[PDB]
Amino acid sequence: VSPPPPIADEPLTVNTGIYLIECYSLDDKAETFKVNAFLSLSWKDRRLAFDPVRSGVRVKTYEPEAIWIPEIRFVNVENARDADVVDISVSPDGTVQYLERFSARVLSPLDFRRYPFDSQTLHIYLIVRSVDTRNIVLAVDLEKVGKNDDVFLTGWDIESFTAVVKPANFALEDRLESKLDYQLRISRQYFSYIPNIILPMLFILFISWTAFWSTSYEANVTLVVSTLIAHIAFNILVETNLPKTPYMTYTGAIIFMIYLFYFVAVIEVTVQHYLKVESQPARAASITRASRIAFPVVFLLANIILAFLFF
Amino acid sequence: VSPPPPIADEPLTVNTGIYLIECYSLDDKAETFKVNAFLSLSWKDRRLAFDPVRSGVRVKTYEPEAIWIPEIRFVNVENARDADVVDISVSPDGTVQYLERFSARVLSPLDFRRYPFDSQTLHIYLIVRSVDTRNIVLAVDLEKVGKNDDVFLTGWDIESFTAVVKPANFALEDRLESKLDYQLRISRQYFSYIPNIILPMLFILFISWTAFWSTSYEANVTLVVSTLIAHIAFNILVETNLPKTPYMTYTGAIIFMIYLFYFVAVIEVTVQHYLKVESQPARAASITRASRIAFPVVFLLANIILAFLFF
Amino acid sequence: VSPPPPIADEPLTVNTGIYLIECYSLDDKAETFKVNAFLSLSWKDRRLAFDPVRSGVRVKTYEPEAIWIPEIRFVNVENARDADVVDISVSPDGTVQYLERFSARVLSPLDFRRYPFDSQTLHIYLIVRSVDTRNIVLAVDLEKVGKNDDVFLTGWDIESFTAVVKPANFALEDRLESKLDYQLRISRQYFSYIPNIILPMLFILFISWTAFWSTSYEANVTLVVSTLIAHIAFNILVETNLPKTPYMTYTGAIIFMIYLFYFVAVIEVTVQHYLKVESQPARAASITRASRIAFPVVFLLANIILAFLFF
Amino acid sequence: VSPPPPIADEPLTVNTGIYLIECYSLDDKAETFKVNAFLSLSWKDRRLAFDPVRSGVRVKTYEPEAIWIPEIRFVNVENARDADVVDISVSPDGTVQYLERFSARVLSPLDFRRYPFDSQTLHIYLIVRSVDTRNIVLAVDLEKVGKNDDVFLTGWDIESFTAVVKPANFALEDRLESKLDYQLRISRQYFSYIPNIILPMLFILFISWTAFWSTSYEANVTLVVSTLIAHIAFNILVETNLPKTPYMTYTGAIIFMIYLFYFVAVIEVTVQHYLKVESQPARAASITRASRIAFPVVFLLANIILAFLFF
Amino acid sequence: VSPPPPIADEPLTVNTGIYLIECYSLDDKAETFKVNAFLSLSWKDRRLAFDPVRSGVRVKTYEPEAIWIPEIRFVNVENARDADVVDISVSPDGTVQYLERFSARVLSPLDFRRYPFDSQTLHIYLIVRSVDTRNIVLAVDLEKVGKNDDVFLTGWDIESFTAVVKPANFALEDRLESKLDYQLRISRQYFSYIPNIILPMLFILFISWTAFWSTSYEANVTLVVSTLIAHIAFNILVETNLPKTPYMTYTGAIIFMIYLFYFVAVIEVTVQHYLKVESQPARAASITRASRIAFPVVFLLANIILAFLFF
């Protein structure tokens, strides 16, 4: 079926909007998330006009393959959306309300530069293939959008759903400049991560720093080295939660800092024993007493510095 | 084929019900479970009337694509159900018994806030696309439903299969207000988890608390630190069973409590040694004797508190 | 094409049988196994009669979509079998030999209650959709069945392939009572598991029990606790082989027994040291000497008890 | 289209051969490998005869669905090969050169009985569904076969590509006796495995055997037990490379031998300490001095025995 | 539709080029990467000629199935590209601009011989099935190619996108000699890997080398052996990042070097203790003092040698 005849040169603006249902599988490995939402389409077609008691039906349902519908295709998806038409209701006023449920594997980059405390911005791109006249998809309904009333994707906090049509193209064709952009700026709630990940590493590190309140070399070595083994094992346990992160993560900088602190603690214990064995107890005691206060303070300063360079 | 002519304005109520077969893969990662069950559909069509010895067939089987069938589609699924028609039997009374086997990837949130002892509630949503008259799917058969006689999904206990039609919609269309809801409230049997997960952590913790019956510093450090390593390794072993759980789990609060107890035990051992080395054996003995009773009691109180805040 | 005209009221019995080819992927996670076997179908149709030197062809191959074939569908599968017709040979006697290769994802519960020594029973269900007359699929060929001559699924031992038609239904329809059941009772060969899993845990446990031939407290603590860490690490190594097993496994009861034995060994070492430090060497020596014999004997008794309650 | 008329009773032999492209994913879990190769088919059809300057085209390309092509189907595959016709060139001589690219998930048993040094033999089976006359697929081209010039599947060494037509059938039909077998005997290069797996276990074992050059019981226990923990951790690290291997592997027999050696080393250390504590230093020294030479020699003998029973 | 009539014997050269969109999943296990890019096709067809104010449309969009398009198929892919036509614009000049979005699972070997610092070269192959006249696909647009402006695949650095048509074939057909090759030479940025992987292993190794500043045998054994356990655990942690790598990796040669260094350190500690116990303190002190400087120097030399043989 040919597109409805344009009465004038006015572009056939289509009213569009996605009502989110289930945003799940937010990281298959680290990147894709899947959506199973509805999208509502409204436009103007030369369908039934005002109908005062002639046919008796207001929402005249039509076959999905009968009436022409604009071709709207997602840009950043694995494959074409699994479109399943739910209800095509055409009103006598002259507008067609199209509602289809699709399950697309949306693509969006995940920026884990501040992993425990990050706030990502998922993206959905819309393009319309113009046939005879230019179609402007910039018409955002702003009334058929929104997630579920539960307001949680998979344990995430939604902040906004700004939909701005950016007059930009991927250096191709002519109608690509009219892209419709869906910005879902979600924020991760971090309460669970504080005891799940952050606190136990600090507890293990403090168990390590205990080694400065001991004059026994064997006990000090056991503390520091076995605590290093415990920290590596806990890192293995945590690593299941963390994504690939090929670049430098924030939580990948605290862990390296903790490794450096283990190395410095081993060096300090060795220096203490080395000075204590060769008839210099005063220097060993001075170094131990200095380190008792110097290690936590330097750790606090390092954490503050990392927070400043990352936030 | 057009829908059968409604004799009056009575909505074409369809009798529906799912007879579960195999509820498996209850957590692909943590969320979806797959079903391979049958669903039975019964309605009223202008098919063959009473047939006293004329055709000789009562269950007149018809082609799946011949007779019109109502469009019933699952809401919370990955894709359209893999419907496979088994038997369309139309009775001379005027009712069509439709039975199709489908394998849908049903979506349902899993609430692991009390993981070992939880009781989830899986969901299945039903909607009917009305064509000419409103279709009410609220007609639940209540006789063609139920799981297998084995009564086990994958090691779960079934409690009820309440099917309540909630007059609610997802703020879209007109017929979405007639949603049919299938509540399968399943409960997890916890006998295996007590020795699989809970008991060994307590055994490791008691091995740690042994360190209060020793006056040797090297032995105490070995006990506590190597027991911490053992606990982290056992946590890694357990973590395969546990799902993602981005929020605060109950079993994720006992583990953090155990980490805190390891930290406090290390602090206590250090305090004992620190006081014992500098000519204060009385204070060290007093602290050790107090801790012997104070650690298990505080652990019991903490477990009771966690149970109260979680249950 | 309509089914061949029944000469009388005799049900159209179809001769069926599956010749297994490759039973692989026996546990995708713990439950499904995939089959890529052939199934042979023989029935009676009003095809070419006796043909003495008229056409000259005995096995008159026909198009898969030309001649009607009975609808046989698997019950416990993910989706419809990937049927691929290989050869439809119709004999002048009046029988059609149908042979199709299918790759279905068969569903079958796996009962790991005696995991190392278990003997499962895989299942395949057959149903026929009757059209005009009742079709009885109880006709098992008993000559076109059997696995490969290699006699191994994926490292399993086949015992029987009993095919009993159970006059039972899933409380639905009328022809479901004629289900055809394929019981493949396979047994797992356990020789590899004895050194892969069972023996190393016993070796680690004996290394632990060594601690009763030592009067050194630090050495005893090192033995028992580091051996507990080694046992947990070996449990992690084993856990890859083991399936989910949400219920109480046999091999999940030996492991818990070993954990309990580690706890009791720690308690015994602590009691020995506690009595030895406070001027009671006689009691410590008596307890150690008793434990030397009492631990292996109690372990043997516990293993015998577990074997009796599990086998 | 009917098959070309056979001029005589000569079977329509088809020239076939696979030119391998990318043999990858050699173990999805342990068994299947995927192929994305081309297969060349040549036969004799009643197509255009000798064409001296009449049409002017030698390789007269035809539509894939226009000219009849023999039905060649893979036996040991997940599903039907993803056949994609590339070029059907028919020569005036009377032969059709058919070339299609397929991506089949070939099935082949992997025999890891000598894992580091094994030499598998992948298999591909060919069958032709005869229609009017018997088709013999035994015609192997022997000129359109071969892997890539790189000569590497995924880090494997190719030795031969023998293609022998075995007159055997799977006890079914009549034309199954003409199966075409493709034997790709590949060999695994083992240089990387010697430092990746074999050498570090030997280094850890030698670190264990160090314990016989020490008279300290605590140091001996630390060495042997912590080395056992290190060996188990390294076994966990290796296990990712190794496949399931439900049966007795060669590399699964060296590991068990190493576990037995750890147990015997613990027993020897205990015996040394037991004799040394009760006023028998001569016997302890004799046992230690004997063990120093007796452990490596027995290990060498055990390795030789395992090599003989496995190779 | 037949191909447009060639005016002369000039081959129908097609202008082609891929504009990359999302190069993700660069290692499903170790080898494949997926693309979801557009490809632009331009050729010459006998379509509408110069059109001065007759039809009024310049980019006359045509149906994807209406106008003939050349058959361009990817060679090294899992299956046929998921082609989705976006816009077929034919200009009055006589050229057709074809633009389709495809999501192909491109195959390309990954060469991890210098893993942390490598620079791979992904490949895409193009072939055209000639019908009547030879089609030369060597026409590279060089203006419709390029990745996203972000210039990052999944944390990779792009260096060039050279597109050279290599007159080579896979020893098959006649038109295979005209293959079009897309070389995307990407380089991996290594900043994150230095603290993620390389630095912690060096820290653990230095903790091991600490053992040469101690005269205590128990402390030395604890250091070296527990540090070996820590290194193996960290190797397990790293191994998730690393691919299969069946051959000899660079980062798989530093790790083996570190294992050898642990073995040599254990031997040195044993030699020190062995000489110290039997009244040779001078030799033990000399060996310790020599090793203090000899271990880091030999490690530096070994790293330089490995860098030279690998780079």
UniProtKB/Swiss-Prot annotation, chains A, B, C, D, E:
Known consequence of changing residue 226 to A? Increases the binding affinity of TBA
Q: List the disulfide bonds.
A: none
Annotated compartments: Cell inner membrane
A Pfam family of this chain = Neur_chan_LBD
Please give the chief subcellular localization of this protein.
membrane
Give the consequence of mutating residue 222 to A: Increases the binding affinity of TBA. Weakens block by Cd(2+)
GO MF terms on file?
A: extracellular ligand-gated monoatomic ion channel activity; identical protein binding; potassium channel activity; sodium channel activity; transmembrane signaling receptor activity
Q: Mutating residue 218 to Q/D has which effect?
A: Decreases binding affinity of TBA
Q: How does it assemble?
A: Homopentamer.
* Family affiliation: Belongs to the ligand-gated ion channel (TC 1.A.9) family.
What protein name applies here? Proton-gated ion channel
Q: Which organism is it from?
A: Gloeobacter violaceus (strain ATCC 29082 / PCC 7421)
